[PDB]
Design a protein around this motif. Structure first.
Motif, PDB file in Angstrom:
ATOM      1  N   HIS A 110       0.758  -1.003  -0.012  1.00 59.99           N
ATOM      2  CA  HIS A 110       0.161  -0.185  -0.034  1.00 59.99           C
ATOM      3  C   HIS A 110       1.079   1.514  -0.371  1.00 59.99           C
ATOM      4  O   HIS A 110       2.314   1.181   0.217  1.00 59.99           O
ATOM      5  N   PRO A 111      -0.241   2.267  -0.456  1.00 61.27           N
ATOM      6  CA  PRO A 111       1.143   3.883  -0.354  1.00 61.27           C
ATOM      7  C   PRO A 111       2.043   3.723   0.738  1.00 61.27           C
ATOM      8  O   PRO A 111       3.087   4.377   1.470  1.00 61.27           O
ATOM      9  N   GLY A 112       1.284   3.998   2.141  1.00 62.54           N
ATOM     10  CA  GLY A 112       1.880   3.523   3.597  1.00 62.54           C
ATOM     11  C   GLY A 112       3.523   3.109   3.527  1.00 62.54           C
ATOM     12  O   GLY A 112       3.792   4.016   4.845  1.00 62.54           O
ATOM     13  N   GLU A 115       5.948   4.778   3.478  1.00 62.27           N
ATOM     14  CA  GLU A 115       6.716   5.199   4.685  1.00 62.27           C
ATOM     15  C   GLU A 115       8.033   5.072   5.398  1.00 62.27           C
ATOM     16  O   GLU A 115       8.691   5.730   6.530  1.00 62.27           O
ATOM     17  N   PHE A 116       7.339   3.828   6.453  1.00 63.19           N
ATOM     18  CA  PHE A 116       8.894   3.171   6.924  1.00 63.19           C
ATOM     19  C   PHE A 116       8.756   2.147   6.510  1.00 63.19           C
ATOM     20  O   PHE A 116      10.089   0.770   7.110  1.00 63.19           O
ATOM     21  N   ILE A 117       7.376   1.419   6.580  1.00 60.60           N
ATOM     22  CA  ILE A 117       7.782  -0.413   6.035  1.00 60.60           C
ATOM     23  C   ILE A 117       8.862  -0.478   5.490  1.00 60.60           C
ATOM     24  O   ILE A 117      10.048  -1.814   5.539  1.00 60.60           O
ATOM     25  N   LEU A 120      12.816  -0.588   5.284  1.00 63.33           N
ATOM     26  CA  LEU A 120      13.390  -1.007   5.676  1.00 63.33           C
ATOM     27  C   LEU A 120      13.535  -3.017   5.045  1.00 63.33           C
ATOM     28  O   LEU A 120      13.404  -3.705   6.576  1.00 63.33           O
TER      29      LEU A 120
ATOM     30  N   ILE B  63      -2.833  -2.844   5.615  1.00 64.44           N
ATOM     31  CA  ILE B  63      -3.379  -2.229   4.280  1.00 64.44           C
ATOM     32  C   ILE B  63      -4.729  -1.442   4.614  1.00 64.44           C
ATOM     33  O   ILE B  63      -5.447  -2.269   5.456  1.00 64.44           O
ATOM     34  N   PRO B  64      -4.937  -0.280   4.279  1.00 64.06           N
ATOM     35  CA  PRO B  64      -5.763   0.543   4.439  1.00 64.06           C
ATOM     36  C   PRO B  64      -7.267  -0.690   4.930  1.00 64.06           C
ATOM     37  O   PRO B  64      -8.203  -0.260   5.591  1.00 64.06           O
ATOM     38  N   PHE B  87       4.068   3.245  13.016  1.00 64.08           N
ATOM     39  CA  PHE B  87       4.229   2.463  11.193  1.00 64.08           C
ATOM     40  C   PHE B  87       3.958   1.868  10.045  1.00 64.08           C
ATOM     41  O   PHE B  87       4.531   2.122   9.403  1.00 64.08           O
ATOM     42  N   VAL B  88       2.836   1.567   9.891  1.00 63.99           N
ATOM     43  CA  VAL B  88       2.441   0.595   8.821  1.00 63.99           C
ATOM     44  C   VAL B  88       1.665   2.400   7.451  1.00 63.99           C
ATOM     45  O   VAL B  88       1.487   1.681   6.346  1.00 63.99           O
ATOM     46  N   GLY B  89       1.709   3.731   8.306  1.00 65.22           N
ATOM     47  CA  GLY B  89       1.840   4.503   7.224  1.00 65.22           C
ATOM     48  C   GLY B  89       0.920   5.365   7.544  1.00 65.22           C
ATOM     49  O   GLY B  89      -0.161   4.543   7.866  1.00 65.22           O
ATOM     50  N   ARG B  90       0.202   6.764   7.072  1.00 65.87           N
ATOM     51  CA  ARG B  90      -0.708   7.439   7.468  1.00 65.87           C
ATOM     52  C   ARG B  90      -1.798   6.923   6.411  1.00 65.87           C
ATOM     53  O   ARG B  90      -2.756   7.083   7.622  1.00 65.87           O
ATOM     54  N   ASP B  91      -1.668   6.290   6.001  1.00 60.72           N
ATOM     55  CA  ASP B  91      -3.435   6.093   5.154  1.00 60.72           C
ATOM     56  C   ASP B  91      -3.302   4.525   6.039  1.00 60.72           C
ATOM     57  O   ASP B  91      -5.035   5.103   5.576  1.00 60.72           O
TER      58      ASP B  91
END
Lengths: 208, 208
Positions: A110-112, A115-117, A120, B63-64, B87-91
């Protein structure tokens, strides 16, 4: 080599579909939504009805003691493998591995995830190499990524990959690139004839 | 204000413990162990028997679309807050926030947390500041960390702290350092007399 993502939340409906394609799949992956709607006993029910191994896609990401409480209950309920996050640390992963077979998340699609996953993934693979889980899970959108991961992943640890694509030849291409298992959902459970669809993916993979 | 981390499997045991300490707590936090052992409807049952708010500590990290399906189900079952990982993201965080109030994990207390999570705490605090969840989870093991986070966290966002000093007046220090809520699990649910255990902590926090 095929893992059915049984993302069908009408319980008996999901069971019917799983039974119909049982002969052409290696495992069934169930998520939290299904477990929440049907109860954790849906895992034993699927096993009894299909004779197929079950992957509990839980994305465990809690402290060791809590991950332990969860895993003990889910493996006790019959789950063959539990999907766990790597980002919460080695102790939290080990708390689950000590109770049953695990699959570690090293990359997401996913797009998110950007960001952090995903920044790494390289390090998560090195961690997986030391932990020696049954397998790791990463997107199969690009066969080049599968290969990239396979090159870095210790021989013996399997690669499971969702999202390889529904086009003709995508399943065969993902396997050749290094995927031991491809995870397919909608292309199977939403087909007019789920068995025919699963059978066609099977034929593509075992063919040339 | 104390948050009871009711991490037991059995519904009747959970309800009995919750009713016995109700006078001394502010909210009840349900995690996957209890949802698995008693069904997700235990959220509703706990609310009917105590009348306090329920936090669903699910450590959502998918995922979202999957986070959304889980949030919709759990909020629909009566949860007042859902805990999600940053950690998994803003979305993935927003997929949950659009359905109900959330609490974000920005730091953890176990040794594994030092590998990936804690190194990103400053960044996670900034993400939380932008999203503005109901609160964030920060370990209270050392009131130093609670104050560190409190200084950097937007004023309107609450702090809920687990891992509180299993020693003396540590709950009080944590609150003094900026914790709005003290998360207590084992110290109460494994206590010979849970009500007396909850009251002790309650009296400490409320004293001076």
């Amino acid at each position: 080599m095929i893992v059915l993502a049984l993302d069908v939340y009408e319980g008996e409906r999901a069971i019917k579909i799983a039974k119909s394609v049982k002969d052409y799949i290696s495992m069934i992956k169930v998520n939290w939504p299904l477990i929440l709607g049907s109860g954790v006993d849906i895992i034993r029910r699927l096993k009894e009805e299909t004779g197929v191994e079950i992957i509990a896609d839980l994305k465990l990401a809690d402290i060791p003691n809590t991950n332990r409480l969860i895993a003990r209950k889910v493996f006790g309920a019959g789950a063959d493998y539990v999907i766990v996050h790597t980002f919460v640390g080695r102790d939290s992963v080990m708390a689950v591995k000590e109770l049953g077979e695990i699959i570690m998340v090293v990359e997401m699609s996913h797009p998110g995830a950007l960001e952090f996953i995903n920044p790494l993934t390289d390090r998560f693979i090195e961690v997986a190499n030391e932990i020696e889980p049954f397998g790791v899970i990463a997107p199969g959108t690009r066969p080049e990524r599968i290969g990239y991961i396979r090159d870095r992943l210790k021989e013996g640890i399997k690669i499971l990959a969702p999202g390889i694509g529904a086009q003709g030849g995508k399943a065969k291409d993902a396997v050749k690139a290094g995927a031991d298992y491809i995870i397919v959902g909608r292309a199977i459970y939403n087909a007019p004839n789920p068995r025919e669809a699963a059978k066609a993916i099977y034929d593509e993979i075992r063919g040339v």
